[PDB]
Amino acid sequence: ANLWERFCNWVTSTDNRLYVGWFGVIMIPTLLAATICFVIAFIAAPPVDIDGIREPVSGSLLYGNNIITGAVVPSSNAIGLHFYPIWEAASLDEWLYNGGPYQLIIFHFLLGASCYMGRQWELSYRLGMRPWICVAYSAPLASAFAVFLIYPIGQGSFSDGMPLGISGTFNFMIVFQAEHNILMHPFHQLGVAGVFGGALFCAMHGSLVTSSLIRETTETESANYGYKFGQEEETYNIVAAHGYFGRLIFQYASFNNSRSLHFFLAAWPVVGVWFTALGISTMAFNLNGFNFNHSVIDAKGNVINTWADIINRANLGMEVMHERNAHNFPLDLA
């Protein structure tokens, strides 16, 4: 009942509409800082010399962008991996030109989202729950760390981190393909299997449970009113659902254990997205997708093109055009 124990008791209270927690104490300010800076920059930041060549890129709405083309632009290549807080700039004018706001946003964000993950652990403990939802969220969290931190570190500049904008995202992923052939990388291929398969199993699960709802309503009511929040009885018939899906394929390709079914739902996209985050994270150190360029040749030695050579042609058009003013020498090594 001393001042400190009372603060502790409110921080960790399960009666707060939004749970705060000790992780929340770091999460709330870092997320407010990132959010406010992002919004203000997206609307009004002046143009930013992303690639260090005094060729500024306009990112914000007031400087001629729409929602699709707008971005908060990565910080200057002249800065590389150096720390560029506001108080290191001679003026905000300078900080704005060199892309200062990007660093402020991505650092406060990566911190607050890390604490978001731990906040998910923390409230699970306060509620008497099992603990591993945060493990599920480490797959998206790791993917954001990969594109905003790991890839910058390996290539040596935050100017090659992912821009905070729709079209800037597409620019980042085109340049990535040109330089790493992410499409021919198996960890990206496993990401596609994770997100395609997770979309599949979402639709499967949702259609199978919806298919086996027990009749509780009339045809004038939404069927959803046949379930009441916190009723003890299940609302669908899993054995009917199993009896349908097992005949659609065969018996043993259908789950009859709801626990292993939902574990499977959790694990497939989580693991696929760990791998694709690990793909970005290892292409950061330039271990790139398979290279089958000119791998097939004929008895004389002529090259026989495959589809990989055709991929290579497109990759080359992407390479030679990107950052078209920023290279003075013939190899783009970072």
Partner 1 sequence: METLKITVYIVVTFFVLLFVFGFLSGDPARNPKRKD
Partner 2 sequence: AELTPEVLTVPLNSEGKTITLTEKQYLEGKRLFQYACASCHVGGITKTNPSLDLRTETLALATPPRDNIEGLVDYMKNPTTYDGEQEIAEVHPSLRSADIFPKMRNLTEKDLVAIAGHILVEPKILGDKWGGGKVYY
Partner 3 sequence: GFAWWAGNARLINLSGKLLGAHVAHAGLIVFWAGAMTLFELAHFIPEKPMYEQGLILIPHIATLGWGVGPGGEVVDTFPFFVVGVVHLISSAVLGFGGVYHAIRGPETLEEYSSFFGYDWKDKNKMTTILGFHLIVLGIGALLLVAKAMFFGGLYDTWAPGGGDVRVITNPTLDPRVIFGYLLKSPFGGEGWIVSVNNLEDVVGGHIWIGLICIAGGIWHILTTPFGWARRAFIWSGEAYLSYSLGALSMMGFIATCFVWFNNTVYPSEFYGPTGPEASQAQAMTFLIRDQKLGANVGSAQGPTGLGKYLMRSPTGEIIFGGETMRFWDFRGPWLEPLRGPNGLDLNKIKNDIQPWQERRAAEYMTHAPLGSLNSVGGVATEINSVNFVSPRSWLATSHFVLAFFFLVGHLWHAGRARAAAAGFEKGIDRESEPVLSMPSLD
CB of 334 to ligand DGD, least distance (A): 12
Q: What does the alpha-carbon distance between residue 57 and residue 50 come to, in Å, rounded to a whole number? A: 7
Residues 166-205 within binding reach of ligand PHO (CB under 6 A): 196, 199-200, 203-204
Dihedral sign for Cα 244, 250, 256, 260, please: negative
The residue within the footprint of ligand OEY, chosen from 31, 138, 179, 255 (CB under 6 A), is 179
Which residue, 103 or 138, has its beta carbon nearer to ligand DGD? 138
Query: Does 248 help bind partner 2 (rule: CB under 8 A)?
Result: no
Which residue, 65 or 282, has its beta carbon nearer to partner 3? 282
Number of residues that bind ligand PHO (CB under 6 A): 7
Q: What does the alpha-carbon distance between residue 2 and residue 14 come to, in Å, rounded to a whole number? A: 20
Is 332 labelled a binding residue? yes
Is 298 labelled a binding residue? no
Q: How many residues does the chain have?
A: 334
Site string for partner 3, 308-327 (x = CB under 8 A): ----x--xx--x---x-xxx
The residue within the footprint of partner 2, chosen from 299, 324, 328, 333 (CB under 8 A), is 299
What SS3 state is found at 19? coil
Which window, 23-31, 140-148, 175-183, 226-234, contacts ligand DGD (CB under 6 A)? 140-148
Is 120 labelled a binding residue? yes
Q: What does the alpha-carbon distance between residue 217 and residue 295 come to, in Å, rounded to a whole number? A: 64
CB of 49 to partner 1, least distance (A): 21
CB 86 within 8 A of CB 95: yes
Residues 216-255 within binding reach of ligand PHO (CB under 6 A): 248
Q: What does the alpha-carbon distance between residue 134 and residue 117 come to, in Å, rounded to a whole number? A: 5
CB 152 within 8 A of CB 160: yes
Q: What does the alpha-carbon distance between residue 236 and residue 217 come to, in Å, rounded to a whole number? A: 13
Partner touching 179 among Cl ion, ligand OEY, partner 2, none, CB below 5 to 8 Å by kind? ligand OEY
Is 185 labelled a binding residue? no
**Cβ atoms within 10 Å, residue 65:** 17
Is 108 labelled a binding residue? yes
Q: What does the alpha-carbon distance between residue 18 and residue 34 come to, in Å, rounded to a whole number? A: 19
Which residue, 10 or 263, has its beta carbon nearer to ligand PHO? 263
Site string for ligand DGD, 193-212 (x = CB under 6 A): --------------------
Widest CA span of the chain, in angstroms? 89
297 token code pair: 């040749």
Contacts of 96 (CB under 8 A, 6+ apart): 45, 46, 48
Could you list the residues known to form a binding site for chlorophyll a, using ranges: 108, 188
Residues lying near ligand PHO in the complex (CB under 6 A) are found at 196, 199-200, 203-204, 207, 248
Residues lying near ligand OEY in the complex (CB under 6 A) are found at 51, 77, 155, 159-160, 175, 179, 322-323, 326, 332, 334
